[PDB]
Amino acid sequence: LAEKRPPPAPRLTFRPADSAADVVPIAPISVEVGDGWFQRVALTNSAGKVVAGAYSRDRTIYTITEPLGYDTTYTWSGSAVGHDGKAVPVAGKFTTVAPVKTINAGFQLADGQTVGIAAPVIIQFDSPISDKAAVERALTVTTDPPVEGGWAWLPDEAQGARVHWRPREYYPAGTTVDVDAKLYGLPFGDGAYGAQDMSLHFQIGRRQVVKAEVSSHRIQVVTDAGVIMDFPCSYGEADLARNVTRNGIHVVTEKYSDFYMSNPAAGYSHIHERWAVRISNNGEFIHANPMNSNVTNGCINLSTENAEQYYRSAVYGDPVEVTGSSIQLSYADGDIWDWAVDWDTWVSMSALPPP
């Protein structure tokens, strides 16, 4: 009677394998059974928190559907039924990698922020990065309308590495911008890993461009409504390099309504400085005239009344186009100098090829 080999016994395949270590928390995590189906399956961290997962139709595969944490031991629990009708346990463990250090990052813009047509997207990291190419490949920018641009790595700051995204030309007014940085579980190099995924949504406000020909004694503000401000103004006397308003496209960043300054080189210890729009970290403002050539260095001086009008109109990211100056805006001036370099140079600063 009978005399026939029994059916195959269920075989469990753990990916990652049992007692595996240095598992990347974003890697595919799964258990598969052959010659049987899963009755129950679950993955928990050491603290007992269940991880989301799902079976395939056949219930012969269970796959984790959310990212894991770093430096954490996970364990499988459950059972699989074989041809026998007999259940076998589903058990095993693995441990995710514990990075030498986690590198953090942030944007300089807030979600929902409206900025001017020359605003860069600045990602500042809290550490140097070895595989900047790998990091950059994890960045994606989406604009509406679509717009040509590129990522460029600038010299590391004291705090750490940094990459800017710039469109080739000024943004169309109204453009929406979505930035995604899939950095979690990404190896940055030398055993470094990204702290987390990051996203940014912002948008471009109205088009406003400042025309600042240094030899013109004027400054103009141009929008869709045409020339809305045409002011007399003075530029830096240009007797010293510090007194030369730098040439090239500046970006408006911060502005201060009242903030009266201490100028050592001029002689005054309490200069009344109002309605000041910053156009460079080197100290260039468009501001009210305080009144000596040192009292206002490379600044653009307006009447207090005109200065306030421009001040109230100005937005972070606005371009100020300085022309007719001897000294071109540079890295030596600090941020933002992104628009003071040609496109081919900007492309060259990418950690990736052209295309």
Beta carbons within 8 Å of 168's beta carbon, 6+ residues apart: 147, 148, 149, 150, 343, 346
Domains of the chain: 1-97 (no CATH), 98-205+337-355 (2.60.40.3710), 206-336 (2.40.440.10)
3-state secondary structure the chain: CCCCCCCCCCEEEEECCCCEEEECCCCCCEEEEECEEEEEEEEEECCCCEECEEECCCCCEEEECCCCCCCCEEEEEEEEEECCCCEEECCEEEEECCCCEEECEEECCCCCCEECCCCCEEEEECCCCCCHHHHHCCEEEEEECCCCEEEEEECCCCCCCEEEEEECCCCCCCCEEEEEECCECCEEECCEEECCCEEEEEEECCCEEEEEEHHHCEEEEEECCEEEEEEECECCCCCCHHHCCCEEEEECCCEEEECCECCCCCCCCCECCEEEEECCCCCCEEEECCCCCCCCCCCEEECHHHHHHHHHHCCCCCEEEEECCCCECCHHHCCCCHHHCCHHHHHHCCCCCCC
Catalytic residue of the set 164, 233, 250, 287: 287
* Way it was determined: X-ray
Per the CB < 8 A criterion, the answer to whether 316 and 115 are in contact is: yes
287 is catalytic: yes
Cis before 336? omega within 30: yes
Resolution in angstrom units:
2.0
- The first and second tokens of residue 63, run together, are 């796959």
- The first and second tokens of residue 272, run together, are 């009344």
Catalytic residue of the set 164, 233, 250, 299: 299
Q: Which residue has the tokens 């007194």?
A: 243
Breaks in the chain (C–N beyond 2.5 Å) sit after 291
Beta carbons within 8 Å of 81's beta carbon, 6+ residues apart: 10, 36, 37, 39, 87, 88
